[PDB]
Structure formats: structure tokens, C-alpha cells
């Protein structure tokens with residue numbers, strides 16, 4: 643019984659970690675896109691000035 | 692046999708988590724450097740204008 | 741900015757073709773119900789006396 647409970651806990655933790663990794667990758671892609679757009683706007687403003 | 696398999700799974704998960712933490716720290720340092728450079732450029736542009 | 745795609749957390753038994761091994765451990769049924777003797781334990785012992 644204890645081994646089954648521990649296995650279920652480990653499986654739940656693994657699923658949670660997979661979801662966390664997916665959400666982290668999505669958020670990092672979004673942040674990278676935002677930073678690229680910010681750098682482009684900065685370069686444009688500097689050139690215009 | 693089940694205990695050995697579970698121990699191997701836990702060790703693999705721990706190694707993966709360590710690698711994830713290292714990569715996360717590296718990416719956060721990179722993002723912090725990018726944000727610092729962006730803030731410096733913003734201050735410079737504001738002062739120049 | 742490296743992507744987090746190489747992190748594959750493995751499970752124990754996600755879907756191993758649904759084995760469903762029936763153990764059915766009958767350890768409680770392994771009791772020794774020993775039979776009694778041929779008597780002369782309470783009847784003869786009380787009938788003989790001294």
C-alpha cells in the first residue's frame with residue numbers, strides 16, 4: 643500500500659513538472675519575443691533621433 | 692524490483708530538476724542583463740532628447 | 741534563450757500495454773488445521789482415575 647501511494651505521488655509530481663516545463667517554455671518564448679520587439683523599437687527610436 | 696525501479700525514476704527526476712534549475716538560472720541571468728541594457732539605453736535616449 | 745524541450749520526466753507505469761498482473765496472494769489460507777487424536781484424552785483419563 644505504501645509503495646502504491648508513493649508511486650502515485652511520484653506520477654503526480656512528474657505530470658506537474660511536465661506541465662510546469664511546458665508553461666515555462668511558453669512564458670520564455672513570450673518574454674523573448676517581447677525583448678526582441680523592445681530592442682527593435684529602441685533601435686528605431688535611436689536611428690530616428 | 693519495484694523499489695529499485697522507483698529509486699531509478701526518482702534519481703532521473705532529480706538529475707532533470709538539477710539541469711532545469713541550472714538552465715533557469717542561466718536564462719534568468721541573461722534576461723536580467725538584457726533588461727539592464729534596455730534600461731540604460733532608455734535612460735540615454737531620454738537624456739539625449 | 742534555450743528552450744526547455746529536452747526535459748522528459750519518466751514515469752513508473754504510464755501505459756505498459758495494460759498488463760494487470762493478478763497476484764492473488766493466498767497467504768491467509770495457509771493455516772494448518774490439525775486433526776485431533778484418537779480420543780482417550782478426557783474420557784479415559786477421567787474414567788480410569790487411580
Ligand SMILES: *[C@@H]1O[C@H](CO)[C@@H](O)[C@H](O)[C@H]1NC(C)=O
Nearest residue numbers: 660745746747748749750751
Ligand atoms: C518522453 O519519452 C517517451 C519515450 O521515451 C515518449 O513517449 C514521450 O513522448 C517523451 N515525452 C517528451 C515530452 O519528449
